[PDB]
Automatic annotation (TrEMBL), chains A, F:
Quaternary state and interactors: Interacts with RNA-dependent RNA polymerase; this interaction allows 3B-1 to binds 2 polymerases and act as a primer. It also allows the recruitment of the RNA-dependent RNA polymerase to host membranes. Interacts with RNA-dependent RNA polymerase; this interaction allows 3B-3 to act as a primer.
Family stated for the protein in its record: Belongs to the picornaviruses polyprotein family.
Organism: Foot-and-mouth disease virus serotype O
Protein name: Genome polyprotein
Known role: Mediates self-processing of the polyprotein by a translational effect termed 'ribosome skipping'. Mechanistically, 2A-mediated cleavage occurs between the C-terminal glycine and the proline of the downstream protein 2B. In the case of foot-and-mouth disease virus, the 2A oligopeptide is post-translationally 'trimmed' from the C-terminus of the upstream protein 1D by 3C proteinase. Plays an essential role in the virus replication cycle by acting as a viroporin. Creates a pore in the host endoplasmic reticulum and as a consequence releases Ca2+ in the cytoplasm of infected cell. In turn, high levels of cytoplasmic calcium may trigger membrane trafficking and transport of viral ER-associated proteins to viroplasms, sites of viral genome replication.
Highest taxon listed in the record's lineage: Viruses
Coiled-coil blocks: none
Signal peptide per UniProt: none
Protein location: Host cytoplasmic vesicle membrane; Host endoplasmic reticulum membrane; Host nucleus; Virion
Whole-protein residues included: 725 to 932 of 2332
Automatic annotation (TrEMBL), chains D, E:
Signal sequence, renumbered to the chain: none
Subcellular localization, as worded in the UniProt entry: Host cytoplasmic vesicle membrane; Host endoplasmic reticulum membrane; Host nucleus; Virion
Record protein name field: Genome polyprotein
Organism: Foot-and-mouth disease virus serotype O
Residue range from the parent sequence: 505 to 724 of 2332
Physiological role: Mediates self-processing of the polyprotein by a translational effect termed 'ribosome skipping'. Mechanistically, 2A-mediated cleavage occurs between the C-terminal glycine and the proline of the downstream protein 2B. In the case of foot-and-mouth disease virus, the 2A oligopeptide is post-translationally 'trimmed' from the C-terminus of the upstream protein 1D by 3C proteinase.
Quaternary structure, from the entry: Interacts with RNA-dependent RNA polymerase; this interaction allows 3B-1 to binds 2 polymerases and act as a primer. It also allows the recruitment of the RNA-dependent RNA polymerase to host membranes.
Family membership: Belongs to the picornaviruses polyprotein family.
Length: 186, 45, 207, 220, 220, 186, 45
């Protein structure tokens, strides 16, 4: 399949070009809404925790995969293991609010609280990166904040996720011709 | 829909579950499907 | 003969190596009059017209990766520049046209991409730069890239005094070769034009 | 009086990945409108195949120069998304989250010599279970395809999917070194005052490429 | 025999704000009848916009007197429901329970000089990202509107909603001092034997003003 | 939009008056029935607790917001954390009743009892204020009384709330031009 | 209805849940909607 080189028009070339017969694809597992819908473990601050999605470690699946989008949208769903009551204040709320129980507080129950949170940021779509500043991402980009006497385990889960303009994503760089990691074996 | 999977209809309204979207007044798929294929060539047997 | 003659306002820009425009992300600008501006937005057509700017010299010693970034909108002395200094919110697409006229005996190529939100770039991620709306400029073929992109971002309108949503990024992918008959260097220029520029809420006078 | 029920053992542990939704907390919110936004992608493999990305050859460059010696082999590498050559592609980058894959990998070669350089290249695919070819004469007996530089600078070639199994692992095992999926070899049949000219190469998903079973395998 | 069920973890903690109703205790009560009672309000923003309430200018007064000097600026303030000038309005009072707002704030100015005083006033709105105007000549380049005292004593002017985002925070942040929503400035073009006469001002919700996401932020 | 000043007729002036276009309002969150339906934490008496709504702290959301109405009506719903059994006697019942278990007593269960109570006051509508006395609000204005060996946490929740004749409501009075409280940030 | 939100019909009667109201024999909304708008003015272009 020759073509013009500079064009940047997509040119897929099937195996048909040399005999051979394209097969059936099934791609459910690399659907964005699907792949992003899992729990991912963030390392908490002892007490007040802003619920940023950028707090997710950029190596982890949900971490690094969310980072390919420059703009995204999701509803959140945190599962947090804590002592005392847990209290979530919306987005753009004084941090002093984290003390008033009328804010969606959840009373303690073994062995973790799991609750779904609405997207609540005043922008249409959040961003994984922001060139207002050439970290250093607008404070407004968040899902709210939680507080407990002690949060210990905290897990994010994106629901309904939408994603826009893909940015690069990058594998671990090998030294030998094959990155020869030890595969599960019977 | 995503990574949800139950046949029973959800207990809570919908407005209480998700946030409700609002219309006002997809691309990469098109882009992929538009991919030219085969040959610029005058093929031979 | 792959001619293409653009125009924006009363300017133009023919080219006899077109290879054709790439539309990045969307082939038409979306909704403009939103709830966030109370219908006080307005189009300023006279802003939409080309403006030149030098980028770099592509010197034969440039290795792979030698990238240059141009955040947009830039220092701009004309109408579009004045707008920026006289309205608080605005939005526009871009319509970019990078030329690197060497000669057809030069070798190697540049890649030209419009990348949203680019505060500088890691080296290893330059390898995947073709994720953004791009085009190649390979002297044996063409002299010009041409890329059009819509307004993007977290907000319907932007404050450009504090946020530059696009960066133009020209990269060296294979180094230049002068060989016997090619140019000794190649200077690279950009010829950029705003598109569908709208503005809202005018600042008080500079007094 | 009340409906009896048997609260069963072994069920309703939190499972990090379970389909069930969580219990709402705060209601009636309406998002700002985001229809007709630009640039949306609903599937990583749509983004993988619309947008090919560079390979990494020795000395850390995306191209492979020509050679004025008796040697003809421009490059040669295991067909493994875990490969060193693939290591910077988007496709490799995405495969590290999935344990097995299937289907065709495209491989685009763009020549970028001066208008007076010319060359023929070849690209064979040698299946596993024998040493890979060292010479084009030998490799001619593989699924090769062979092109030459002209007015059209690009050339794309699908690497066929061939395996005894239906899917194939995305990652190498530390035990296995003989390369289970076979090799691709890019040769250089001839060249004409082309010396020192680059052939930049890029790789994407084919129509039928597909990844499966996600896994977080550290993977930085 | 009995219907199995999986009592799941992570669910059915009491949540202070959850939709579910509680279990009844004592039944069959009938209220005394209360239909056609007077004065009912079913929405705080209906009460906010039917009933404008005073602004608070320096020395703790709802009016702003005229001035027989070279200075022309009657008042000037951040457009913030957290503002000091707003601090006694019902609208500010209600906004302290909600984290973000949107839409138009009205601003009614009632002149209350003697029948022989006369004046022109102006009211610009300067968007954020530049110093606010100090003079009417300068402010003339804003969304201003300008009126004069007559048989009709009142004048209402909507402050337009303009922001890059769709909603805007109701409260100031202790870090941010440059005022994110811009300013309103009330000037005094001219006056005619009007010195010492008051222009009382009041503020309400517009048709399209709306508050959202309640929060208890102490707020006394 | 000029108008006559003393009239006290509502005069809304749209942005249309200077070009510009009124947008869409959505006001679900400032609906009375909605905003008042949350749990609010009152500080209990150790044992006998009259269930007044005025016992709610006048700064809190449900507190201060209920106080804008001069007359209101709601059904209550208390959630109380206690030791021993908890016993609720209706409205206008001798306080000596709080001992007889036949009155809607609830036996102890971890970790709080939550029960809905009917509006039970002999007046059509209660009042947040009452000029019989120029505190000092008729004893009849209540939802009953609860008693336990020790009530510790007690939370009110208005259901079906109706409200009548709005009285003023007042923000915290700032010293600087902006009340510059510290907003939740990522 | 309020800050309730389930699709399933409630388990208890209704008389056992709420107190039941009784007819015998809204304003601020009207008031707000009645708001005069635009101009007393004879507008110019």
């Amino acid at each position: 399949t020759t073509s013009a080189g500079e064009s940047a028009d997509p040119v897929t070339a099937t195996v048909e070009n040399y005999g051979g017969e394209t097969q059936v694809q099934r791609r459910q597992h690399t659907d964005v809404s699907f792949i992003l819908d899992r729990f991912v473990k963030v390392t908490p601050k002892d007490q007040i925790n802003v619920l940023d999605l950028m707090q997710t470690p950029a190596h982890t699946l949900v971490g690094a995969l969310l980072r390919t989008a420059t703009y995204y949208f999701a509803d959140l769903e945190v599962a947090v293991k804590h002592e005392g009551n847990l209290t979530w204040v919306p987005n753009g709320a004084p941090e002093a609010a984290l003390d008033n129980t009328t804010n969606p507080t959840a009373y303690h129950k073994a062995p973790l609280t799991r609750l779904a949170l609405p997207y609540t940021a005043p922008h249409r779509v959040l961003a994984t990166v922001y060139n207002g500043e050439s970290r250093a991402l607008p404070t407004s980009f968040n899902y709210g904040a939680i507080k407990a006497t002690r949060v210990t385990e905290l897990l994010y889960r994106m629901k309904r996720a939408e994603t826009y303009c893909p940015r690069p994503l990058l594998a671990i760089h090998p030294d030998q011709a094959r990155h020869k990691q030890k595969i599960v074996a019977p | 829909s995503g990574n949800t999977g139950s046949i029973i209809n959800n207990y809570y309204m919908q407005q209480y579950q998700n946030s409700m979207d609002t219309q006002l007044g997809d691309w990469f798929s098109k882009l992929a499907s538009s991919a030219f294929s085969g040959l610029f060539g005058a093929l031979l047997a | 003969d792959r001619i293409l003659t653009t125009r924006n306002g009363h300017t133009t820009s023919t080219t006899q190596s077109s290879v054709g425009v790439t539309y990045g992300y969307a082939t038409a600008e979306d909704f403009v009059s939103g709830p966030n501006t109370s219908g006080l937005e307005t189009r300023v057509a006279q802003a939409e017209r080309f403006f030149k700017t030098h980028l770099f010299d592509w010197v034969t010693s440039d290795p792979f990766g030698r990238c240059h970034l141009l955040e947009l909108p830039t220092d701009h002395k004309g109408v579009y520049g004045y707008l920026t200094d006289s309205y608080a919110y605005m939005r526009n697409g871009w319509d970019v046209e990078v030329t690197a006229v060497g000669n057809q005996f030069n070798g190697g190529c540049l890649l030209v991409a419009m990348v949203p939100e680019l505060c500088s770039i890691q080296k290893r991620e330059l390898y995947q730069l073709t994720l953004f709306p791009h085009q190649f400029i390979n002297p044996r073929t063409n002299m010009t890239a041409h890329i059009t992109v819509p307004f993007v971002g977290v907000n319907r309108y932007d404050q450009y005094k504090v946020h530059k949503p696009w960066t133009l990024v020209v990269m060296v992918v294979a180094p230049l070769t002068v060989n016997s008959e090619g140019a000794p260097q190649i200077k690279v220029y950009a010829n950029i034009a705003p598109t569908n520029v709208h503005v809202a809420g005018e600042f008080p006078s500079k007094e | 009086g009340i409906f009896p029920v048997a609260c069963s053992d072994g069920y309703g542990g939190l499972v990090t990945t379970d389909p069930k939704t969580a219990d709402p907390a705060y209601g009636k919110v309406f998002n700002p409108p985001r229809n007709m936004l630009p640039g949306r992608f609903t599937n990583f493999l749509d983004v993988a195949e619309a947008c090919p990305t560079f390979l990494h050859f020795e000395g850390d460059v995306p191209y492979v120069t020509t050679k004025t010696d008796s040697d003809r082999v421009l490059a040669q590498f295991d067909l493994s998304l875990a490969a060193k050559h693939m290591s910077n592609t988007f496709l490799a980058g995405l495969a590290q989250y999935y344990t097995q894959y299937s289907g065709t990998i495209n491989l685009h070669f763009m020549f970028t010599g001066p208008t007076d350089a010319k060359a023929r290249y070849m690209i064979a695919y040698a299946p596993p279970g024998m040493e890979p070819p060292k010479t084009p004469e030998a490799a001619a007996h593989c699924i090769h395809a062979e092109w030459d530089t002209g007015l059209n600078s690009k050339f794309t070639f699908s690497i066929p999917y061939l395996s005894a199994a239906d899917y194939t692992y995305t990652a190498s095992d530390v035990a296995e070194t003989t390369n289970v999926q076979g090799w691709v070899c890019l040769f250089q049949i001839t060249h004409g005052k082309a010396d020192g000219d680059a052939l930049v190469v890029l790789a994407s998903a084919g129509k039928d490429f597909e990844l499966r079973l996600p896994v977080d395998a550290r993977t930085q």
